[PDB]
Design a protein around this ligand. Sequence first.
Ligand SMILES: *[C@@H]1O[C@H](CO)[C@@H](O[C@@H]2O[C@H](CO)[C@@H](O[C@@H]3O[C@H](CO[C@H]4O[C@H](CO)[C@@H](O)[C@H](O)[C@@H]4O)[C@@H](O)[C@H](O)[C@@H]3O)[C@H](O)[C@H]2NC(C)=O)[C@H](O)[C@H]1NC(C)=O
Ligand SMILES: *[C@@H]1O[C@H](CO)[C@@H](O[C@@H]2O[C@H](CO)[C@@H](O)[C@H](O)[C@H]2NC(C)=O)[C@H](O)[C@H]1NC(C)=O
Ligand SMILES: *[C@@H]1O[C@H](CO)[C@@H](O[C@@H]2O[C@H](CO)[C@@H](O)[C@H](O)[C@H]2NC(C)=O)[C@H](O)[C@H]1NC(C)=O
Ligand SMILES: *[C@@H]1O[C@H](CO)[C@@H](O)[C@H](O)[C@H]1NC(C)=O
Ligand SMILES: *[C@@H]1O[C@H](CO)[C@@H](O)[C@H](O)[C@H]1NC(C)=O
Ligand SMILES: *[C@@H]1O[C@H](CO)[C@@H](O)[C@H](O)[C@H]1NC(C)=O
Lengths: 108, 939
Amino acid sequence: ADPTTDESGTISHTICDGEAAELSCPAGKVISIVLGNYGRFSVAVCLPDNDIVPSNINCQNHKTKSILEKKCNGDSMCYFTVDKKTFTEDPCPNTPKYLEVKYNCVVP
Amino acid sequence: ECPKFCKCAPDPVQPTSKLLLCDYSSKNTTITPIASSNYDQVANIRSLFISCDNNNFQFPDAYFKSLTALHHLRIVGCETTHFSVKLFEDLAALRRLELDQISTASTSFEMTEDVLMPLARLEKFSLTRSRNIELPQRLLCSLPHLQVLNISSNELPSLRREESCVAQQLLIVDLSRNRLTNIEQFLRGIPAIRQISVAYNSIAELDLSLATPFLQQLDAEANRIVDLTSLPGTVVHVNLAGNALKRVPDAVAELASLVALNVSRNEIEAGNSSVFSSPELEMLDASYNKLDSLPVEWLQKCEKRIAHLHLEHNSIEQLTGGVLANATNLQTLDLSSNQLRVFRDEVLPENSKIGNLRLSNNSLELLEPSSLSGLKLESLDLSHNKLTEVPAAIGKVEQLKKVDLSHNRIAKVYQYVLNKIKQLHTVDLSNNQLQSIGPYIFSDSSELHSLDVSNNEISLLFKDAFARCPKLRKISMKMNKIKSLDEGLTEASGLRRLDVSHNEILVLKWSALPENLEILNADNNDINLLTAASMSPSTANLKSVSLSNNGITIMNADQIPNSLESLDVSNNRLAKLGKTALAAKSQLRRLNLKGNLLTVVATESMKVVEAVHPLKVEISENPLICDCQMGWMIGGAKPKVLIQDSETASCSHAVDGHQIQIQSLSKKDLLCPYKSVCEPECICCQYGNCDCKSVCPANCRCFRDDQFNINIVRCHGNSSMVPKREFVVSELPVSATEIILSGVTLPQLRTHSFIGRLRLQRLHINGTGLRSIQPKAFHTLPALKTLDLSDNSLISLSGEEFLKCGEVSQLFLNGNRFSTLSRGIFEKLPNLKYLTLHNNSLEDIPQVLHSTALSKISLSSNPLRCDCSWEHNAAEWFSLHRHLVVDFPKVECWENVTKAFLTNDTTVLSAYPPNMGNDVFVMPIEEFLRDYNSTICVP
Ligand SMILES: *[C@@H]1O[C@H](CO)[C@@H](O[C@@H]2O[C@H](CO)[C@@H](O[C@@H]3O[C@H](CO[C@H]4O[C@H](CO)[C@@H](O)[C@H](O)[C@@H]4O)[C@@H](O)[C@H](O)[C@@H]3O)[C@H](O)[C@H]2NC(C)=O)[C@H](O)[C@H]1NC(C)=O
Ligand SMILES: *[C@@H]1O[C@H](CO)[C@@H](O[C@@H]2O[C@H](CO)[C@@H](O)[C@H](O)[C@H]2NC(C)=O)[C@H](O)[C@H]1NC(C)=O
Ligand SMILES: *[C@@H]1O[C@H](CO)[C@@H](O[C@@H]2O[C@H](CO)[C@@H](O)[C@H](O)[C@H]2NC(C)=O)[C@H](O)[C@H]1NC(C)=O
Ligand SMILES: *[C@@H]1O[C@H](CO)[C@@H](O)[C@H](O)[C@H]1NC(C)=O
Ligand SMILES: *[C@@H]1O[C@H](CO)[C@@H](O)[C@H](O)[C@H]1NC(C)=O
Ligand SMILES: *[C@@H]1O[C@H](CO)[C@@H](O)[C@H](O)[C@H]1NC(C)=O
């Protein structure tokens, strides 16, 4: 889906498995990853087109926030593909996963 | 063994023998013969008691057999009309017979001259409390060895005796409480009599000097005696209370050794002073009389022998001094209820033994300082008088132990009056006009026990007022103007019950209390604050406290002393209760929250740390809320707090606010709303897209239960500011188990609106303007059981919107535009039991509803066509299924009479004249099916 910013200026982003992820900050600022999780925390988000409701909504990859901060922080824009290759592990096999990333844009 | 319905006992008069106590009141069962029970100690039964309350109780002829050693027999309440003569043959050792209540206003009892023939050796015969009895005129002839005769409370109008019968051992006669007017014939010829009690009768003329010459005690209370005729010179006790006395009768004033005279409640005058003769009169009770002043002719002979003088309710104006100045044996003097104004000094002797002096309800104005000089008084009464202070006649006694000075006009209490008496146990200064309680007016009374200054004007308490008294234990100050308790009672460490109720005390300091107080009462004050009961040492000994009708608005752990066993804070303004107020107070047993303004009384304010006992609570009359925090109100916790008034205690509901009975409050009501929360074990709670995160949408109220099982989301578009946006269902909480979007504006259900809601059980998207339902909008709802799409703009429903909803059993389609019921409904609603399709546009009965498992269905207010059954009519399905319709008298046949003529679709209903103003003829459905073959469908 589209990145959404709340009242405190934190931009969130929800990107499905196998898709391209683009984080971007305006001129003069750099990305600051607040949160990061690659897995499944919702039944409704990124529905499989096969009509199989996901039964695993307590799926967590704890290395996600640390791998996103070493990849996107200090940079004004970040690119990668969301799959099990980028986050080093499959936190719940046979469950559709997605990266949910929230980030702040701070002056370097 | 003791026989049937009777219990043995060792005889009190003779503890070596065996008493028996029978109670055949219990039942109408048979009367076991005592001789046939062969009790091991029948000859040890010397006294025998029987008690009944049933009527017509008759003894078996063979009952009192083998009791040949029975000396005393008491029969109580066993009514009859006569006893068996054979019964009293085997009881020659009987020395004392008692009968009590053997007849009422109905049963007539006759003491037979032959029933008592085998009862000569009866040395005491007692027959009390019974009406309409007949005694033989030769009653005394059967019982000559008679000594004490008691037939009281029997209302016998006359007593007649044959003149040949002489009771020559009759000592004490009891005729009291009867209707006797003259008995001379009975007493004539019975001279042994020494004691007579003809009390409570209507005797008019009494003559006894030539009848009972040894009469020693005469009791004639409550009669019509105007003046006596003659007495024996032996009378030592004359009781003439409640008679027609206008002066002292002569034959009593002439007595030789009269010890006591009670001529009270008469209308005697003290002008007609007869001269008393006996110098042995030691007690004189001329109370409730019309005396103007004490006559000296009376006491003239017993000045050094008189001891007790009760003289209340007379009209003594002044004790003309000198009359009592020689009564050295005078131990009691009662002069209450007269018109004395000054109790002068020359009335009493110098060293009188007076221990009782009673002078209440008088006009007493002055007690001169010498009338009570040197007295050894124990009890001094002077209430309802006109004293102006505590008079110094009372400084002279040193033995004074109890004092009453209430309802007077005392304005002040000095130091010397009530200090110089050390032996004073009790003081009363209530209902006076004290303005304050001065210091050291109570110090040197180190034997004080009770002090009363209630119903006064005390505005202040001096710090030193209560020192030097380590025995004063009870003080009452109710109904005063105590506006503060500073200083005044901190020092008296022997007090145990203090009264400061009905005052002006604004704030309550526990430190401003004595240190051994055990009962406190601060009722009907202005108290609105409780100090630190934890930084106050004078709380360790407090057991009960009542702060009812005050203004305490909060109570915490520090304001509730931990050692109290009782607490009463009823009719206060308690909105909060500190959340550990009853935690560390393990000793409390009762708790009164009656009449407060509490709303949420949390579970932690009643959880008692290691309470061994049930905690009693009155929590009625409080604007409570029954939410999930009132878990203790159901009673499944320990300590198991038991609500006393759960039968009237009420609370309002957590959703709508209707009244709930706390007695019938269940685990289902306790809802406590929220705006955002997280389930147990929820890992993504910090995130925005989290399933276990229950975030409330705008314009929605969200409730829940304690354990994340109930989740009510009840949204409403009851806004005159009409929702200019559809309702976005994707914003609702994920774990919702009931959804009501009712009044909001939502015209379309997209594909996959409700996907993945496994917990959802009720869904009421009614009143949203739903025109279209995209398929799979109700996807995977396994616990979904009730669906309500009523009162919208739906015209037909396919069955492709319902995917995986097998548990559905209720579907509400009323208030729409439904004309057809497809088959796709029952292929996906198997558990379907309840259905509503009333108030719609149904033109006929859908032919899917001929083979369905519905149990209740509603199909009224629908334009249904009724023909004579071309095989599918309405009245044909209805006469077969009219039980399935909940509103059968609410369905009506419709036929547009204007269309069916132009379309030639002629039906049986276009031949009646249509309703005035309409093109349709309307007839109730019951009228069509009853009149089916009778008139309508006849060819
Ligand atoms: C001599 O004859 C007297 C007839 O006047 C006998 O007097 C009887 O005394 C008893 C005992 O008191 C009465 O029974 C009750 O008495 C109380 C007394 O007042 C108490 O109560 C009031 C409040 O009600 C209180 O203000 C006082 O301080 C007392 O504590 C009455 O109030 C009761 O209503 C009730 O009458 C008898 O009524 C009274 N008369 C009779 C006919 O019984 C006296 O007993 C005789 N002498 C002996 C030695 O027996
Ligand atoms: C207080 O004293 C007065 C005396 O005047 C009592 O008044 C009389 O009470 C008697 C009762 O024995 C009545 O028979 C009289 O009629 C009353 N006198 C009247 C009405 O003038 C009064 O009852 C006493 N009260 C108390 C509590 O002791
Ligand atoms: C039958 O259903 C219709 C529609 O649900 C009801 O008409 C509504 O009536 C209420 C109050 O009478 C109004 O506030 C609404 O605006 C009406 N809606 C429409 C679409 O007209 C009607 O009252 C129902 N009749 C019965 C007997 O229940
Ligand atoms: C007479 O008997 C009755 C009841 O048994 C008792 O109350 C009363 O005091 C008796 N009187 C006597 C023994 O003088
Ligand atoms: C009391 O007794 C004495 C004895 O001498 C007598 O003189 C006196 O008059 C009596 N009465 C009074 C009121 O003193
Ligand atoms: C919708 O149904 C609910 C019951 O869940 C009812 O209380 C409410 O009144 C209905 N809405 C309207 C607008 O009638």
